[PDB]
């Protein structure tokens, strides 16, 4: 009934042996792993927020799904990246069975785990994502930028060298045709063009406005190293 769940009070109290317990009593009565609370939250969503890596292992083995979307479309692996853990991405991708684990998901807002985990710094998480297949180039819907674009417009040298290593395309365009060498040239991120141009970067790549990254250089500074 409403307003109850045992299920999910167990998992916030960090109790396995309880959620153990209780995914028996579901299991032998029928029920679903996957129910929702108000918030539209599973078990599972709550066990990765809570950060308890052996309760998300505990219930994706017993077959709860890491598709099941939370209120803003997450899945667990996005919650994971959003809660800089990457123990519980870790404890899903372990657990999950294949086929039913897809790395490419979107959020309501459009972005892919991978996205999620750019944006908030955490290497650790990032480079799990990439071990585990996730596409390096996706491009959401909402920004029609790829995580290399996300990493510049964060003005973030450490995921940006990161991704390209990792093999990320460094010609990647927006929708307005702009690539990150002309976001990191625009906006005078000395650090970022020095590396985007030694990592292969095309300084004659013409966006919308029939831009080239020089001609939106920012400062004489960005200008000499697109010059070489």
Known sequence: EDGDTPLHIAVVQGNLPAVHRLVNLFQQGGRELDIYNNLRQTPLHLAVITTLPSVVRLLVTAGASPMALDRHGQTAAHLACEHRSPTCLRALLDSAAPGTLDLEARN??????????????????????????????????KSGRSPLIHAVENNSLSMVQLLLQHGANVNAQMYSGSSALHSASGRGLLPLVRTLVRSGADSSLKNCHNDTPLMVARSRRVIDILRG
Request: aromatic share 2%; net charge negative.
């Open 108 to 141: 309501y807002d459009g972005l892919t785990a991978l996205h999620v985990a750019v944006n908030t710094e955490c290497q650790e998480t990032v480079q799990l994502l990439l071990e585990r297949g996730a596409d390096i180039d996706a491009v959401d819907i």
